[PDB]
Scaffold this active site. Sequence first.
Site, PDB file in Angstrom:
ATOM      1  CG  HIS G 200      -2.243  -0.964   0.541  1.00 55.49           C
ATOM      2  ND1 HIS G 200      -3.240  -1.385   1.392  1.00 55.49           N
ATOM      3  CD2 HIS G 200      -2.474  -1.579  -0.652  1.00 55.49           C
ATOM      4  CE1 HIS G 200      -4.044  -2.212   0.742  1.00 55.49           C
ATOM      5  NE2 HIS G 200      -3.603  -2.341  -0.500  1.00 55.49           N
ATOM      6  CB  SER G 204      -0.969  -2.366  -8.254  1.00 56.37           C
ATOM      7  OG  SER G 204      -1.438  -3.359  -7.345  1.00 56.37           O
ATOM      8  CE  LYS G 226      -8.167  -7.499 -14.471  1.00 55.66           C
ATOM      9  NZ  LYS G 226      -7.327  -7.422 -13.138  1.00 55.66           N
ATOM     10  CG  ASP G 227      -9.987  -8.869  -7.398  1.00 57.48           C
ATOM     11  OD1 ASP G 227      -9.272  -8.829  -8.446  1.00 57.48           O
ATOM     12  OD2 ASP G 227      -9.590  -8.316  -6.349  1.00 57.48           O
ATOM     13  CD  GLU G 270       1.072 -34.309  -3.591  1.00 60.07           C
ATOM     14  OE1 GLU G 270       1.098 -35.554  -3.713  1.00 60.07           O
ATOM     15  OE2 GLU G 270       0.212 -33.599  -4.153  1.00 60.07           O
TER      16      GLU G 270
HETATM   17  C1  HEM Z   1       0.048 -16.114   0.943  1.00 61.66           C
HETATM   18  C2  HEM Z   1       0.782 -15.802  -0.358  1.00 61.66           C
HETATM   19  C3  HEM Z   1       0.503 -14.434  -1.009  1.00 61.66           C
HETATM   20  C4  HEM Z   1      -0.567 -13.628  -0.921  1.00 61.66           C
HETATM   21  C5  HEM Z   1      -1.835 -13.833  -0.119  1.00 61.66           C
HETATM   22  C6  HEM Z   1      -0.353 -12.548  -1.662  1.00 61.66           C
HETATM   23  C7  HEM Z   1      -1.372 -11.514  -1.799  1.00 61.66           C
HETATM   24  C8  HEM Z   1      -1.039 -10.445  -2.763  1.00 61.66           C
HETATM   25  C9  HEM Z   1      -2.047  -9.479  -3.136  1.00 61.66           C
HETATM   26  C10 HEM Z   1      -3.435  -9.469  -2.656  1.00 61.66           C
HETATM   27  C11 HEM Z   1      -1.428  -8.583  -4.088  1.00 61.66           C
HETATM   28  C12 HEM Z   1      -2.061  -7.426  -4.769  1.00 61.66           C
HETATM   29  C13 HEM Z   1      -2.749  -7.861  -6.080  1.00 61.66           C
HETATM   30  C14 HEM Z   1      -1.833  -8.599  -7.041  1.00 61.66           C
HETATM   31  O1  HEM Z   1      -0.990  -8.040  -7.708  1.00 61.66           O
HETATM   32  O2  HEM Z   1      -1.939  -9.771  -7.162  1.00 61.66           O
HETATM   33  C15 HEM Z   1      -0.035  -9.021  -4.204  1.00 61.66           C
HETATM   34  C16 HEM Z   1       0.933  -8.290  -5.069  1.00 61.66           C
HETATM   35  C17 HEM Z   1       2.374  -8.672  -4.926  1.00 61.66           C
HETATM   36  N1  HEM Z   1       2.902  -9.807  -4.254  1.00 61.66           N
HETATM   37 FE1  HEM Z   1       1.895 -11.209  -3.242  1.00 61.66          FE
HETATM   38  N2  HEM Z   1       0.856 -12.673  -2.384  1.00 61.66           N
HETATM   39  C18 HEM Z   1       1.386 -13.860  -1.822  1.00 61.66           C
HETATM   40  C19 HEM Z   1       2.654 -14.513  -2.159  1.00 61.66           C
HETATM   41  C20 HEM Z   1       3.631 -13.612  -2.819  1.00 61.66           C
HETATM   42  C21 HEM Z   1       4.759 -14.086  -3.294  1.00 61.66           C
HETATM   43  C22 HEM Z   1       5.106 -15.565  -3.252  1.00 61.66           C
HETATM   44  C23 HEM Z   1       5.480 -13.085  -3.791  1.00 61.66           C
HETATM   45  C24 HEM Z   1       6.821 -13.190  -4.489  1.00 61.66           C
HETATM   46  C25 HEM Z   1       7.940 -13.541  -3.537  1.00 61.66           C
HETATM   47  C26 HEM Z   1       4.789 -11.970  -3.675  1.00 61.66           C
HETATM   48  C27 HEM Z   1       5.354 -10.649  -4.060  1.00 61.66           C
HETATM   49  C28 HEM Z   1       4.293  -9.714  -4.506  1.00 61.66           C
HETATM   50  C29 HEM Z   1       4.555  -8.552  -5.158  1.00 61.66           C
HETATM   51  C30 HEM Z   1       5.942  -8.033  -5.543  1.00 61.66           C
HETATM   52  C31 HEM Z   1       3.408  -7.930  -5.419  1.00 61.66           C
HETATM   53  C32 HEM Z   1       3.300  -6.613  -6.169  1.00 61.66           C
HETATM   54  C33 HEM Z   1       2.935  -6.940  -7.616  1.00 61.66           C
HETATM   55  C34 HEM Z   1       2.565  -5.740  -8.472  1.00 61.66           C
HETATM   56  O3  HEM Z   1       2.001  -4.776  -7.981  1.00 61.66           O
HETATM   57  O4  HEM Z   1       2.798  -5.759  -9.675  1.00 61.66           O
HETATM   58  N3  HEM Z   1       3.592 -12.212  -2.950  1.00 61.66           N
HETATM   59  N4  HEM Z   1       0.095 -10.105  -3.412  1.00 61.66           N
HETATM   60  C1  LIG Z   2      10.071 -37.038  -0.504  1.00 59.63           C
HETATM   61  O1  LIG Z   2       9.484 -36.280  -1.539  1.00 59.63           O
HETATM   62  C2  LIG Z   2       9.869 -34.965  -1.459  1.00 59.63           C
HETATM   63  C3  LIG Z   2       8.887 -33.920  -1.004  1.00 59.63           C
HETATM   64  O2  LIG Z   2       7.575 -34.285  -0.667  1.00 59.63           O
HETATM   65  C4  LIG Z   2       7.453 -34.739   0.689  1.00 59.63           C
HETATM   66  C5  LIG Z   2       9.295 -32.461  -0.991  1.00 59.63           C
HETATM   67  O3  LIG Z   2       8.444 -31.623  -0.613  1.00 59.63           O
HETATM   68  C6  LIG Z   2      10.703 -32.033  -1.394  1.00 59.63           C
HETATM   69  C7  LIG Z   2      11.197 -30.568  -1.347  1.00 59.63           C
HETATM   70  C8  LIG Z   2      10.668 -29.841  -0.099  1.00 59.63           C
HETATM   71  C9  LIG Z   2      11.149 -28.631   0.401  1.00 59.63           C
HETATM   72  C10 LIG Z   2      10.475 -28.049   1.632  1.00 59.63           C
HETATM   73  C11 LIG Z   2      12.340 -27.937  -0.246  1.00 59.63           C
HETATM   74  C12 LIG Z   2      12.521 -26.499   0.269  1.00 59.63           C
HETATM   75  C13 LIG Z   2      13.710 -26.344   1.244  1.00 59.63           C
HETATM   76  C14 LIG Z   2      14.074 -25.060   1.698  1.00 59.63           C
HETATM   77  C15 LIG Z   2      15.223 -24.841   2.654  1.00 59.63           C
HETATM   78  C16 LIG Z   2      13.312 -23.870   1.220  1.00 59.63           C
HETATM   79  C17 LIG Z   2      11.658 -33.090  -1.844  1.00 59.63           C
HETATM   80  C18 LIG Z   2      13.049 -32.689  -2.211  1.00 59.63           C
HETATM   81  C19 LIG Z   2      11.249 -34.549  -1.883  1.00 59.63           C
HETATM   82  O4  LIG Z   2      12.073 -35.420  -2.229  1.00 59.63           O
HETATM   83  C1  LIG Z   3      -4.801  -2.554  -6.909  1.00 60.70           C
HETATM   84  O1  LIG Z   3      -4.085  -3.781  -6.839  1.00 60.70           O
HETATM   85  C2  LIG Z   3      -4.758  -4.718  -6.061  1.00 60.70           C
HETATM   86  C3  LIG Z   3      -5.704  -5.694  -6.684  1.00 60.70           C
HETATM   87  O2  LIG Z   3      -5.930  -5.639  -8.032  1.00 60.70           O
HETATM   88  C4  LIG Z   3      -4.938  -6.438  -8.638  1.00 60.70           C
HETATM   89  C5  LIG Z   3      -6.405  -6.728  -5.841  1.00 60.70           C
HETATM   90  O3  LIG Z   3      -7.193  -7.531  -6.367  1.00 60.70           O
HETATM   91  C6  LIG Z   3      -6.196  -6.801  -4.379  1.00 60.70           C
HETATM   92  C7  LIG Z   3      -7.031  -7.884  -3.655  1.00 60.70           C
HETATM   93  C8  LIG Z   3      -6.658  -8.239  -2.209  1.00 60.70           C
HETATM   94  C9  LIG Z   3      -7.573  -8.786  -1.298  1.00 60.70           C
HETATM   95  C10 LIG Z   3      -9.007  -8.995  -1.711  1.00 60.70           C
HETATM   96  C11 LIG Z   3      -7.130  -9.111   0.131  1.00 60.70           C
HETATM   97  C12 LIG Z   3      -6.858 -10.598   0.356  1.00 60.70           C
HETATM   98  C13 LIG Z   3      -5.872 -10.785   1.524  1.00 60.70           C
HETATM   99  C14 LIG Z   3      -6.166 -11.641   2.597  1.00 60.70           C
HETATM  100  C15 LIG Z   3      -5.179 -11.809   3.725  1.00 60.70           C
HETATM  101  C16 LIG Z   3      -7.472 -12.403   2.643  1.00 60.70           C
HETATM  102  C17 LIG Z   3      -5.225  -5.801  -3.745  1.00 60.70           C
HETATM  103  C18 LIG Z   3      -4.903  -5.778  -2.287  1.00 60.70           C
HETATM  104  C19 LIG Z   3      -4.521  -4.784  -4.591  1.00 60.70           C
HETATM  105  O4  LIG Z   3      -3.721  -3.982  -4.058  1.00 60.70           O
END
Ligand code: HEM
Ligand SMILES: COC1=C(OC)C(=O)C(C/C=C(/C)CCC=C(C)C)=C(C)C1=O
Ligand SMILES: COC1=C(OC)C(=O)C(C/C=C(\C)CCC=C(C)C)=C(C)C1=O
Lengths: 61, 75, 70, 241, 96, 49, 378
Positions: G200, G204, G226-227, G270
């Site tokens: 925030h 975005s 759109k969401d 998995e």
């Molecule tokens: C529980 C997992 C995650 C949740 C709930 C989450 C939720 C969100 C939401 C709601 C947004 C705003 C809308 C959108 O662009 O999609 C967002 C944007 C973003 N998230 Fe996540 N996300 C998660 C995992 C990640 C991961 C894995 C990454 C990468 C390491 C990430 C990095 C970003 C970044 C950089 C943005 C900004 C994107 C942009 O504005 O272009 N987040 N996320």
């Molecule tokens: C037995 O089958 C296997 C899984 O299923 C149970 C896995 O999930 C993974 C990989 C899992 C993880 C958490 C790797 C990430 C490690 C770090 C430090 C981020 C491997 C290699 C695997 O062999």
């Molecule tokens: C302007 O860009 C953004 C969107 O458009 C791409 C979104 O759609 C959302 C949607 C996020 C939601 C509904 C919150 C969910 C989080 C939890 C922990 C339930 C956010 C925040 C946002 O910033």
Amino acid sequence: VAPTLTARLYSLLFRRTSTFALTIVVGALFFERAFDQGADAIYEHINEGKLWKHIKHKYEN
Amino acid sequence: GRQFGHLTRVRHVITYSLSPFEQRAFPHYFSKGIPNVLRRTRACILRVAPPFVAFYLVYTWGTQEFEKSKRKNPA
Amino acid sequence: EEEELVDPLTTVREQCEQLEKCVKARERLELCDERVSSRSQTEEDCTEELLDFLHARDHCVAHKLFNSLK
Amino acid sequence: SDLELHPPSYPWSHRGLLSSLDHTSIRRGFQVYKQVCSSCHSMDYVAYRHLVGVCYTEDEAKALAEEVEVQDGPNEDGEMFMRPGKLSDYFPKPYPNPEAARAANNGALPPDLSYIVRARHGGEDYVFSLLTGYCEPPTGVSLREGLYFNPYFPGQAIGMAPPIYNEVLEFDDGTPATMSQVAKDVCTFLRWAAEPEHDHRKRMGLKMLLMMGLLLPLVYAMKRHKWSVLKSRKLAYRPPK
Amino acid sequence: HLVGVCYTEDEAKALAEEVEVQDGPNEDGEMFMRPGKLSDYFPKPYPNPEAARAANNGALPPDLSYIVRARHGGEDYVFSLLTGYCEPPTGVSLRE
Amino acid sequence: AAKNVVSQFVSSMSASADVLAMSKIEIKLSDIPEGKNMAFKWRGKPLFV
Amino acid sequence: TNIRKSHPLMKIVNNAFIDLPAPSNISSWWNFGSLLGICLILQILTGLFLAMHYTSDTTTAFSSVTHICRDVNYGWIIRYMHANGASMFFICLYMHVGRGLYYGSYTFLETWNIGVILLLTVMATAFMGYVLPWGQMSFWGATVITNLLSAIPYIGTNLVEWIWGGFSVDKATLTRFFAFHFILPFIIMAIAMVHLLFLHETGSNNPTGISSDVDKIPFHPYYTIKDILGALLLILALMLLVLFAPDLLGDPDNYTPANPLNTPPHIKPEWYFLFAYAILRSIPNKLGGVLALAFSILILALIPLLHTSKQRSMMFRPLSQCLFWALVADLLTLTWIGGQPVEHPYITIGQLASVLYFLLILVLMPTAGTIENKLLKW
Ligand code: HEM
Ligand SMILES: COC1=C(OC)C(=O)C(C/C=C(/C)CCC=C(C)C)=C(C)C1=O
Ligand SMILES: COC1=C(OC)C(=O)C(C/C=C(\C)CCC=C(C)C)=C(C)C1=O
Ligand code: HEM
Ligand code: HEM
């Protein structure tokens, strides 16, 4: 009976959010039933393996 | 943060808009629509497609070598 | 068992087993079959040619089978 | 040994996306389970009441449970007696310890049936192709006279004897007990014991597709209507001079 | 459990060895007998709770492992019970 | 749709392998002398005779 | 004054989903953030209902899972929604990270780094999830994984035994994994809020990578709907999976109860870890394998330091696009290899793909950015 048609729906029911809601809730009730039976019958036709066989075994209870 | 009215400075730009109840949700949908998707496709194939076929090929070859390997003629 | 119950499997398998792809695979079966018989200290054991024959046969089996089965 | 063959694609009557089971075929398959398989195969997760909605009726299902004895709970003396069979019990029977299966069939266990179809790779096809497709050992590969032959088996050294043509049966109305036929039914029934929810799920899945086909365009049109304002917006730049 | 408390490794082993347990199944699906480890517990009297009743008569000698903490009065209730046995006064007959 | 998913999650908290109710216990009357209340286990509940 | 704007509680809502200035040109790819939001709640809700019947004891673990599918009313969908939702959670997770990479979104350091923590957390979460049914794959998966930690010099044996609660994956280990699998998604949520908190401060990014202050729209009609349309698409995918092919992404062996003596010839994760799995076994070393396994995920934290281009997004950069798509294609190869035995072809291709993964992110992509700058005379 076409331009005036969606016009009446709006006039009599969509204008107020009151009726709008009442209509979709009254509309959810009937629709549920019509979709359920209507889809059961489609699932019924493409099959005929389950309880169509019931007529036999039972009745003898 | 953010808000509206505190974003940035803009001058001399007019924006004509029309109410959603006065226009169609799907104007030339198939007419202008499909040409656009083809054009978007052209624009991107040469950048998206190649990497993938390289895998497609590596996948089918990779499978053939493996299965053909567990067979044997003399010795 | 001795004579009395008509296995659809056996019936459709005949027509199936016959056909081109399986004729050829069984040819190699027998070819390789007769090699292994013709020796002593060998180990190239014909396990493969059998499965290939079976595959070709069995694909055709499935396609034509179940139709008659009631 | 390290070489293998994969099962064909049999046209089961429950193969299609929106396809129910042949409930008459689950019956005969239960019959196949009851006599043949049961003596060696544990089906720990299925019960008699489970059959009620499926194939038989209340009465019939009661009766089939009554043809066995269970070993009910203790009374006053701290006992362990025998009871006719409810509807409430399950099908755990063969023998207690897993080691008893080994002692009998020889260091091998007829793996529990309740989850087989879903635990193999290839569903009913693996099992059908196994049961039906028994064959004779080719050159140089001798066995151990308890290790029968099946091409559809990892390594091909299996501990199970081919029990599908032993023509038993009570195909009530009249169905021939050929090896093929008993196998379809036994697998059709097995599908059911592994996945009892099978039909109902496909009924919901049918409804999920019809609902989505109605909902998807509608939500799309709702969203396009609201995005209209932006899609047809026209800009003009009018600087001084 | 007794090792850190009262006895020693050796002594505790021995006391467990003076009973028989009914160990796990082997090849035949059995149920044989074993000397007694250190790993086992003290569950012995009889299986079903009903057997206690059949014996002592519709009564169970409640498990000892948690008694002190389950009475009201701790060891005092039990001590006063065990030690303070007495004779039935007037008009209150029992059931032998 | 909302009804259906909500109804299903709600229903998931009712039946099971809990349809039992067999019992129908036959009780020997000469085992309970005059003035005594004998309790039994009936359909998971205490039954007084 | 209004009510939305002033009320302490509603403010937060207003500032996050109503009046939030959003770029007018974000596309699907921006939907995965809300979709992850939905997947998180879906995982929690079906996850809770399963916990109302599930038993964490090896004696009844599998049985309780079976009890759910046959006896518990509608227990089966709940169970499959859970299972398939976990996969849906990874498809969305991967789209999301990729979207960030292509578009330069990672330049929001805190947001992104928090995102990495969110990735690790749901990964640690899902791994513990899969062990719960106590299937053959649950146990051997649990075994193969945890044991990796024994490669850490001098501390590894004690560490593995500490998390095991014994010398094997036993009773102590299952119950343990239940507890952590219950608490982890709540913590994830608190972190998802901090993720959204940092997001925030800037609002975005958008496809062009160019600032959009000049053309923002309210999140209030445009992105709410759109969401919505997009969540409906997530439901379709999930339901298509659960009501037609509930085992398609599942392993038929986790259906056979755990047996600490029976090692399946199989033994694979998995699908969502298959790429990392492939990277791990590509190395003929115990330490290096796990050092590089870790590095294949933690590298996302190095990405912002390797940004080299004068433009933010990839929309205007062709050379970089090709390299990006080769990364995705290389990740298909990695998962495919990871799901295959360590015998012929598979060893050397999965070995070279591992090198490529790191050559791409660490050397090739940056070099391309420098070249591109140069072509533009920048
Ligand atoms: C529980 C997992 C995650 C949740 C709930 C989450 C939720 C969100 C939401 C709601 C947004 C705003 C809308 C959108 O662009 O999609 C967002 C944007 C973003 N998230 Fe996540 N996300 C998660 C995992 C990640 C991961 C894995 C990454 C990468 C390491 C990430 C990095 C970003 C970044 C950089 C943005 C900004 C994107 C942009 O504005 O272009 N987040 N996320
Ligand atoms: C037995 O089958 C296997 C899984 O299923 C149970 C896995 O999930 C993974 C990989 C899992 C993880 C958490 C790797 C990430 C490690 C770090 C430090 C981020 C491997 C290699 C695997 O062999
Ligand atoms: C302007 O860009 C953004 C969107 O458009 C791409 C979104 O759609 C959302 C949607 C996020 C939601 C509904 C919150 C969910 C989080 C939890 C922990 C339930 C956010 C925040 C946002 O910033
Ligand atoms: C038609 C009823 C039966 C069916 C459908 C059936 C099905 C199966 C299946 C699917 C397997 C495991 C296949 C695999 O592991 O990949 C199996 C294994 C086995 N069954 Fe049967 N079976 C039946 C009757 C019997 C009977 C009557 C016996 C007693 C002779 C028997 C003894 C075995 C044994 C010993 C194995 C283990 C083989 C091994 O792994 O070494 N089964 N059966
Ligand atoms: C706190 C909310 C959650 C609870 C209470 C919960 C509880 C459970 C329970 C009791 C099981 C065992 C029952 C079963 O196997 O079906 C399980 C399995 C699993 N869960 Fe969760 N979980 C929750 C959130 C998650 C999250 C965030 C994920 C990660 C996407 C996740 C992925 C899994 C997986 C992969 C399995 C095993 C596969 C299977 O369904 O059989 N769940 N969970």
